[PDB]
From a paper:
Cytosolic [name] ([name]) is a rate-limiting enzyme that catalyzes the reversible conversion of oxaloacetic acid (OAA) into phosphoenolpyruvate (PEP) providing metabolites for several metabolic pathways. We have recently reported that [name] activity and stability are subject to a strong posttranslational control by acetylation, phosphorylation, and ubiquitination in response to cell energy input. Thus, the ability of cytosolic phosphoenolpyruvate ([name]) to perform its reverse reaction (from PEP to OAA) depends on its acetylation level on conserved residues close to the active site. By applying several biophysical and biochemical approaches, we have found that acetyl-CoA promotes the self-acetylation of [name], which occurs in the absence of a lysine acetyltransferase.
Analysis of the crystal structure of [name] revealed that chemically acetylated lysines were not localized in a specific region of the enzyme, but interestingly, we found acetylation of two lysines inside the active site, K244 and K290, with essential catalytic functions. To analyze the consequences of acetylation of these sites on the kinetic properties of [name], we used a previously described method to generate site-specific acetylated [name] variants at positions 244 (K244AcK) and 290 (K290AcK) in Escherichia coli ΔCobB. In both cases, acetylation of either K244 or K290 resulted in an enzyme with residual activity (≤1% of controls) under saturated substrate conditions. To gain insight into the consequences of acetylation on K244 and the mechanism of chemical acetylation we crystalized the [name] K244AcK variant and [name] WT in the presence of acetyl-CoA. However, we were unable to obtain a complex between [name] and acetyl-CoA. On the contrary, we were successful in obtaining the crystal structure of [name] K244AcK. The structure showed that acetylation on K244 prevents the coordination of Mn2+ with this residue, but interestingly the acetyl group of K244 establishes a hydrogen bond with Arg87 in the R-loop, which is essential for catalysis. These results indicate that acetylation on K244 affects the Mn2+ coordination and also the interaction and synchronization of two essential loops for [name] catalysis, leading to [name] inactivation. During catalysis, K244 is essential for the coordination of the manganese directly bound to OAA. According to this, site-specific acetylation of K244 prevented manganese coordination and established a hydrogen bond with another catalytic residue, R87, which explained the low activity observed for the enzyme.
Residue numbers in the entry: 3 to 622
Write the structure that this text describes.
């Protein structure tokens, strides 16, 4: 069927067989092999042997280090210019801008970043032709969600990065069994390249191939394509992790009547043996991993982790909002993780874990800010920049965005249902932020519509990065600000429509704030495992207990409804205080923010909830 060789790349295949691929997977591979011109094609099978060989080969080539202190753990150090998501180079392509993002009244949108098809085609043509010369194109067949879950979705990621293959093995279900489940079905096309064809035009920094100048992370939801170039890091390269499971998935969910959210899922069991599942959307590094892996301090309470980052949710036939964790691993922020803050996370990462941009002890161990483990005299620290490091230095030993990548099955409190194909029934949805002033420990929404407004109005103190210096308070609606797959106003409309589904078992909605400070700057609430005392109250409110008092912002716990025994003197007046003056300012800021950033796409229900909140505050 060819006059020469076709687009038959069989001669370059060093693992697997092209003849064994479903026809459309094969066309995807060969079409992109022609474009990108890899030296080799490796069709991943997902086997332990493949994984071990891959790691051993990366070690030999100097791309990763084996950490000799642990069982099968590895360290990658990156080029300092490739250490995080780059928001300003992450884009969504649609025919109409407004389908992707509301048109902001001033400045740049904070809620999305559109690129025209025309501009994207020009960007694509300047990057991908020949970009894998000299390299292997890996074909990663992967399932987001348990294989054969009705909520699962399948992608194929092409990458030139073996780091990406190894990380994707942990973070997704991948290999031959996914191709067998796919058959001739639809899949999400995921194309990635580090953008460094051989021979190198510039020297490598830390043996880490990237192209910072040309980095571009693009999404084409209508084409079911994700196309990422020039970064090997995290959410730019592991295309399941944000591009697929939030950005593409949230647009599919809008089309198909489900939800793709930035939420942890936990199961909580009380002393009576009653269990509920909760979902929580917290702006990142607020303690998602912390809540989902909590060791509760209250006797007889248990928390089990279904997921710590992404939730796919859909109503079942009985009206329960069912959630699955579509991932297979945790890609957690390393700094701050310790035996005191998160002993379960520490147990998880003891083995079979890939670390990125943390410090290394002369031991062959790992280190970072906040690890809270002293080292023996003489044990030294190599920073993530491959330099000797002493605490005296201004710089951190580990990058602030450094990561562990670890199998979910190794979490010592992984929920028995964490892979159940039908998902777990969500009875509560928790929104949070870090707010040093004004916002009390916990409150409960007055209605579904109020609950959606609570999510839409979320703000949080975030550590200023390459966009800000110091802490900054930013709007992060539904903890989804960087992740919306489409116009945020339509996303709110989609949430609001859930109230209209007949016989829906709508979860209770709450907001929490672990980080309120008192008049001279100290934390009012100890947090960590003591947060179980707040989950207890939510649990009782889901059961309809008469434990709540009405306030202008929502229901709060009645006096003495919280178990505070053992906490010493809690300043309840300040912790649970509601200031008219603070809340007048909060509602005015939310009004300005929604008008500027959402304007004509804001649902009238949300504007009504703002109006109503304004009025309940006026009457204080």
């Amino acid at each position: 069927p060819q006059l020469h060789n076709g687009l038959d790349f069989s001669a370059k295949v060093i693992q697997g067989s092209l003849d064994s691929l479903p026809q459309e997977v094969r066309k995807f591979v060969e079409g992109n092999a022609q474009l990108c011109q890899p030296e080799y094609i490796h069709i991943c099978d997902g086997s332990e042997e493949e994984y071990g060989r891959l790691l051993a080969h990366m070690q030999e080539e100097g791309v990763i280090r084996k950490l000799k202190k642990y069982d099968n753990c590895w360290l990658a150090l990156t080029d300092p210019r490739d250490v995080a998501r780059i928001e300003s180079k992450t884009v969504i392509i649609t025919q109409e801008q407004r389908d992707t993002v509301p048109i902001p009244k001033s400045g740049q949108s904070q809620l999305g970043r559109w690129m025209s098809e025309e501009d994207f085609e020009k960007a694509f043509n300047a990057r991908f032709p020949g970009c894998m010369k000299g390299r292997t194109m890996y074909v990663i067949p992967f399932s987001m969600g348990p294989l054969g879950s009705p909520l699962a979705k399948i992608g194929i990621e092409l990458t030139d990065s073996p780091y990406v293959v190894a990380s994707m093995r942990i973070m997704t279900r991948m290999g031959t069994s996914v191709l067998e489940a796919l058959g001739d079905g639809e899949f999400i096309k995921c194309l990635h390249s580090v953008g460094c064809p051989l021979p190198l035009k510039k020297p490598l920094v830390n043996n880490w191939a990237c192209n910072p100048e040309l980095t571009l992370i693009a999404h084409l939801p209508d084409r079911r394509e994700i196309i990422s170039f020039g970064s090997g890091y995290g959410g730019n390269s592991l295309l399941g992790k944000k591009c697929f499971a939030l950005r593409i998935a949230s647009r599919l969910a809008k089309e198909e009547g489900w939800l793709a959210e930035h939420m942890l899922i936990l199961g909580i069991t009380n002393p009576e043996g009653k269990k509920k599942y909760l979902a929580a959307a917290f702006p990142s590094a607020c303690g998602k991993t912390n809540l989902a892996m909590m060791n509760p301090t209250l006797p007889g309470w248990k928390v089990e982790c279904v997921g710590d980052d992404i939730a796919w949710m859909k109503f079942d036939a009985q009206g329960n909002l069912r959630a699955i964790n579509p991932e297979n691993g945790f890609f957690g922020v390393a700094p701050g993780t310790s035996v005191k803050t998160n002993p379960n996370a520490i147990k998880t990462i003891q083995k079979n874990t890939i670390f990125t941009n943390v410090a290394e002890t002369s031991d062959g161990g790992v280190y970072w800010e906040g690890i809270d483990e002293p080292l023996a005299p003489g044990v030294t620290i190599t920073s993530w920049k491959n330099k000797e490091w002493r605490p005296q230095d201004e710089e951190p030993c580990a990058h602030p965005n450094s990561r562990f990548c670890t199998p979910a099955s190794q979490c010592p409190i992984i929920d028995p249902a964490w892979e159940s194909p039908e998902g777990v029934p969500i009875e509560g949805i928790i929104f949070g932020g870090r707010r040093p002033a004004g916002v009390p420990l916990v409150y409960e929404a007055l209605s579904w519509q109020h609950g959606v407004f609570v999510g839409a109005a979320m703000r949080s103190e975030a550590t200023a990065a390459a966009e800000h210096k110091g802490k900054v308070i930013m709007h992060d609606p539904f903890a989804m600000r960087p992740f919306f797959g489409y116009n945020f106003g339509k996303y709110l409309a989609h949430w609001l429509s859930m109230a209209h589904r007949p016989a829906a078992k709508l979860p209770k909605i709450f907001h929490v704030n672990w980080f309120r400070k008192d008049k001279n700057g100290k934390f009012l609430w100890p947090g960590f495992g003591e947060n179980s005392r707040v989950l207890e109250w939510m649990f009782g409110r889901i059961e309809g207990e008469d434990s709540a008092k009405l306030t202008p912002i929502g229901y709060v716990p009645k006096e003495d409804a919280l178990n505070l025994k053992g906490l010493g003197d809690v300043n309840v007046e300040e912790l649970f205080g509601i200031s008219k003056e603070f809340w007048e300012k909060e509602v005015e800021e939310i009004d300005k923010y929604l008008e500027d950033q959402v304007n004509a796409d804001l649902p009238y229900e949300i504007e009504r909830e703002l109006r109503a909140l304004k009025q309940r505050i006026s009457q204080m």
